[PDB]
Design a protein around this nucleic acid. Structure first.
Lengths: 202, 194
DNA sequence: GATTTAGGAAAAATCTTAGATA
DNA sequence: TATCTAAGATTTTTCCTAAATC
């Protein structure tokens, strides 16, 4: 019935915001606020807590951030239910976080009543998906072929398409075709978006 | 004597946060919260308001965002004092924003008290703008074009948004890269995240 | 039976340059 | 002096479409 929450976000003004917005829900209890991964993981065993609410990227270098951070948490506190609350509009990175079996994603964009919804579905033992989230996942075997991986690696290294083409003794259109379809598979629409995925799981 | 604030940020959870933290200060009045540039500029004349508190980037395509958006505001409501509350430790982009002559910056990182400080200095030359200044500088368009790019927008798309030619925007991006001593798009973005 | 490879067509982004601004 | 703008020819990349490969 009653609920124990830990909030982790590196923007203190946001942390304040989540605390104040969660303060409203009388079956929720804020039990720790944390600003880095390290303070978080150190105090995790100390608070019996049901729910962790985190952003992806934050400071904290021994335990990391993003996927890594969580994966560590699911591994070591499997009892603990994580909601990711992110600014991240990237379909692929969100998609990777959903392959982790977490209990929620909630974008920081247009989601005033989303969090309470996300948390309320956690009592029910159900998942919530913001309309905003599923919209972001509309683009989406999504696993990529060996050439596709190569072409992508080289690209994520700084190499240009025409340069990749020279290196692998293949046509520019071949390499572009390869990159382009990798991006299709990954549900990612532009180079900025691709590179950001490419450093998320890396 | 009393103070009227308009808050504009696209994260509603954050908007809530700022409203609740400002709610504490009895000589401050939240008079409008806004989530895009267009709703903001449309309601600007409707609220006699002293202070706009904004992030850089938000939706709103008639009037844009960031520098452009600000500059539009200082042009049309020069009475209005803007505090920018932003979420990036990019030195270059911030550099351009501090050359803008607004009446406050506050980073979203580590600044629970900074916002009422910023507002309180406005009662009584800029302290807040002084505060992290120490920490090859790029031109206002150059910063914008770069920001927008690093936001995921394509050169062609940037061009559409700003009602300017693709060659203008490319020329701007390219020279920003030159200023920054960076060779290619991969290299630029990687800088842009430090 | 999907991946690997490209052709021409096409569009997107850069290398010029150059007037204008301020 | 540095910055804002964009036409002009050029380069890079993608769109569309289709062949051999494995």
């Amino acid at each position: 019935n009653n609920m124990n929450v830990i909030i982790a976000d590196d923007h203190p003004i946001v942390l304040f915001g989540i605390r104040k917005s969660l303060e409203q829900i009388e079956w929720v209890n804020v039990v720790g606020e944390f600003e880095d991964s390290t303070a978080l993981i150190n105090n995790l065993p100390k608070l019996d807590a049901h729910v962790l609410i985190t952003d992806l990227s934050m400071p904290g270098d021994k335990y990391g951030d993003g996927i890594t951070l969580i994966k560590y948490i699911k591994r070591h506190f499997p009892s603990l239910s994580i909601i990711v609350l992110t600014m991240n509009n990237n379909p692929a990175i969100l998609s990777a976080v959903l392959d982790l079996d977490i209990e929620g994603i909630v974008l920081k964009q247009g989601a005033p009543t989303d969090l309470p919804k996300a948390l309320a579905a956690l009592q029910k033992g159900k998942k919530f998906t913001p309309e905003s989230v599923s919209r972001l996942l509309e683009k989406i075997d999504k696993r990529l072929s060996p050439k596709e991986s190569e072409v992508l690696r080289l690209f994520a290294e700084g190499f240009l398409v025409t340069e990749i083409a020279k290196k692998l003794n293949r046509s520019i259109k071949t390499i572009s075709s390869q990159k382009k379809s990798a991006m299709m598979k990954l549900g990612v629409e532009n180079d900025i978006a691709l590179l950001n995925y490419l450093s998320s799981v890396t």
